[PDB]
Nucleic acid binder design. Sequence first.
RNA 1: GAACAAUAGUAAGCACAAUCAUAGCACAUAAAAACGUUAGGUCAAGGUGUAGCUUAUGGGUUGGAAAGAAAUGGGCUACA
Lengths: 77, 138, 99, 132, 136, 85, 194, 101
Amino acid sequence: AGFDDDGSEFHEHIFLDKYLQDFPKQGPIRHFMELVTCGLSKNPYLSVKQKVEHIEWFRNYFNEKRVILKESGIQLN
Amino acid sequence: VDVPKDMTKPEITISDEPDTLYKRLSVLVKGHDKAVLDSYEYFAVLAAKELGISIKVHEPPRKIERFTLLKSVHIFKKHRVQYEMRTLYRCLELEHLTGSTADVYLEYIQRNLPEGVAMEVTKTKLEQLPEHIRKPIW
Amino acid sequence: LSEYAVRMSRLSARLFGEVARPTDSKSMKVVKLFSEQPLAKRKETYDWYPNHNTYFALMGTLRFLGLYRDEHQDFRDEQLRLKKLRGKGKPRKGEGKRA
Amino acid sequence: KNRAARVRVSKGDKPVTYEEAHAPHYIAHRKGWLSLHTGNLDGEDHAAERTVEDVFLRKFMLGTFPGCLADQLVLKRRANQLEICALVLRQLPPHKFYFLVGYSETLLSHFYKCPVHLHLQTVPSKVVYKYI
Amino acid sequence: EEVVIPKKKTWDKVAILQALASTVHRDSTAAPYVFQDDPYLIPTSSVESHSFLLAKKSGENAAKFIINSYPKYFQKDIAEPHIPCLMPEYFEPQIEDVSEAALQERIKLXXXXXXXXXXXXXXXXXXXXXXXXXXX
Amino acid sequence: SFFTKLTADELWKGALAESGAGARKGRGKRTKKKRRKDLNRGQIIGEGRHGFLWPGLNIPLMRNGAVQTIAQRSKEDQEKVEADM
Amino acid sequence: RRKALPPRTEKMAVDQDWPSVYPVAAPFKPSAVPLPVRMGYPVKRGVPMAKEGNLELLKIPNFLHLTPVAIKRHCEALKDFCTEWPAALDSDEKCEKHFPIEIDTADYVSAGPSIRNPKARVVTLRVKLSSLNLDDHAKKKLIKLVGDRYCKSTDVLTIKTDRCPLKRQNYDYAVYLLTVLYHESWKTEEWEKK
Amino acid sequence: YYVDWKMLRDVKRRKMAYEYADERLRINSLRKNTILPKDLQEVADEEIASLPRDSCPVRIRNRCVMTSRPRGVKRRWRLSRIVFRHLADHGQLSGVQRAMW
RNA sequence: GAACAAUAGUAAGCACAAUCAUAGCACAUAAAAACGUUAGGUCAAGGUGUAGCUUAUGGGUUGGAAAGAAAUGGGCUACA
Ligand SMILES: [Mg+2]
Ligand SMILES: [Mg+2]
Ligand SMILES: [Mg+2]
Ligand SMILES: [Mg+2]
Ligand SMILES: [Mg+2]
Ligand SMILES: [Mg+2]
Ligand SMILES: [Mg+2]
Ligand SMILES: [Mg+2]
Ligand SMILES: [Mg+2]
Ligand SMILES: [Mg+2]
Ligand SMILES: [Mg+2]
Ligand SMILES: [Mg+2]
Ligand SMILES: [Mg+2]
Ligand SMILES: [Mg+2]
Ligand SMILES: [Mg+2]
């Protein structure tokens, strides 16, 4: 009572694959981000917006550090 | 002699949405002392028999939590003080209830719940089948 | 272990939302990090100490207003008054050492 | 010798109340607890949150009713609303008693974000159980 | 065909509480509920009852005055539902420099109402027919 | 720091040290004086440092037939009251 | 000017209704209770302390507002809000045939300003596989797909959901899980042929 | 004021840990994984080292609420073993009694 | 300040006892054990009387608080 979680549903929490479209599909970035998504989906302590902000933080961190991923030997975007 | 007139004016309406059915309602009342639990059990049985619920009541086993602390302030470990916390449980088993009957019984139970006890409510909601499992082929 | 069994296990994790592709226990730590709330964010941790400043300020303001009466503070004030009357008070800041 | 919550025996003239006349080993045997809540049960939580509020209430009421308080408070916690039962000597006029109870029933409620009830029982003097 | 599913009944949050209240009528030998039941605090005469009610209200408003004067001591919220009626109130405008925001803040909170309009008219600010109606 | 405070009875009991271990057999009697002063002798409940006048404690509840609001004493009147105290 | 008023005991009627005096929970004020009750450990020559100034009586909760007459009077007025249980579901044998799905939901109450109980997010869904339309191959695939959540002896599948913060979201996720398990138990893929 | 300067500093440590809870949680993911190359993990080590010292939850010490005692404090009541006894013996805590068996 | 085939002893009360807890008794265990002795331990759980600090005996950051020539108390592993 008194907590609606912004009127969200189970699909806004469990299914977060729609936020991983701006990532290399066949690279280790997907391997790490699927683990992150699985961890976030099983987290009742956070709302959808905080998970979206975490995904955005990972996105901008990866898009900012471009020299290290190219130097590592694996082609990433 | 001075009894007020027209003292009843409730707002009760019946909606077309089918009422929810419950198979079993389990009420686990945890407390510290047994006299309060026995009085509450008698009160709950008397309230349920008026509404016709046929409540089943049994007593779950107690739980005792004991811990040990130092008896003195600075240095005395050979002498200790042991504290005990008792938790006694009462189980109220209600069967064959509806959504409104369970709601009103829970209202009349929680509105008069004592201060030294807590209550855990477990509802077994009855449902036939969802829409996508009745008779689909992919 | 068979090829049918490993495929069934892989499908079970995908359907349940668990980790589908094989991962190491060392890599499941990052899964658990987002699965469980961090300790620094837990209420039992970040809300451990109540606001003693708020409690003290409220009690002192009520004592000054005339609603609460703090016997400990009254005893401290009486003892300080008696000490100052005797002649051993609190030296002014900056003159204790040199002067 | 045990000295916790134990009042020492004088020559035989000290008035002692029932709560003081019993040692802490008689709790739940001859005397009950001064406070009741759910945080001290088995599968419940938020014990320290209620404990700090209980201590603050004890100190605040002791300072609010100076010298007219007979015994310690009885703090009941029943469904989000907390009741404070007190035994007060009839030293203050009823006009001042009502002012204090009205001030408290609002200040405590606004400070703890929960409804508070305050009940006072006026006694002619401190009730003595053992020798006096 | 054999299954019988009855309909549900929807009632207000206080409907059942009013139904329970209707069962118990006013007592004969009992003092009014607002007054304390202890005989030393039970009113004896009508003037005493009125004085006790006024003293209780003066205590309540005295406490509310302290709550409003010191809002920072009540900013901490403990209840999950976050009841707003127990929160401290503020009597100060949010914006001071902007006349259009100062007028709407000072109309609802008498003496400062004329000063807000005087300050707004000092800078030759055009006031519409909506802010002026509330100021009047 | 409010929770670190205690009762005046316990404060005086520890300050006077009436039940000290050295005073039992007779090692004391050197500073043969033991005076305890009650701080709540002339303490009126409603009065405080700020000099607020509350309708229920300091001033009467009703004046001139009208209800009384919360008042505050003037600076010099408060100084006179403090001088009397 | 001290005033001492006699309590309500001298004015209590012999046949006065008790719920009128004690409608709700009360701190057991001695002035409103005409019953002389002595609570406390007696003395060698003394007697247990009377109801006046007795802290032990105020310590214990009082059920004076829940006397049987008041219980009957309150429950009589509550018959208008309750609904009738259908007689067609008296025995669980027909209940299993009509509503095979059982939904266990946990609700908790606790004294204090807080209502949020983290144990309330768990939702259990119990379904008997004997009441569904799975074929032999679909049942054999579903048993291995669910694993230990299906009891072989009881033939009951249990789905325990706690991932969603809200109970409604957990219930929606559980019904979605049941739907997707039923749909995937029928699809025969390429790797099932080996 | 607070009970002690140690408790005052611990309050600041807890506030800083709560402030930096998200940043440290995000950074530790890059360090506790094996999928990502160690080249970025080494830089993430410097990134998490550049954080303020009091930001980590490790510096948080569980003291007593009443007396700020660094040890002998039960986690359930957040009180020292001595204040807890002083309150239980007075009977201000429900369900607490001397163990007799 | 006592003689039971009784010679100045009554005695509130605190102790002991009884009672309570280890969910049936008994037993046992647990608990309790007064007034006082050891100026016994604790200003470092916490507050404190007196005597002392206030650009310091106060408040913040970093780094270190080893090591065993040797003696000994209590436990674990064994010497089959
Ligand atoms: Mg200090
Ligand atoms: Mg630490
Ligand atoms: Mg004697
Ligand atoms: Mg026994
Ligand atoms: Mg025995
Ligand atoms: Mg012993
Ligand atoms: Mg004994
Ligand atoms: Mg010595
Ligand atoms: Mg020694
Ligand atoms: Mg000191
Ligand atoms: Mg020292
Ligand atoms: Mg340092
Ligand atoms: Mg050695
Ligand atoms: Mg050995
Ligand atoms: Mg070996």
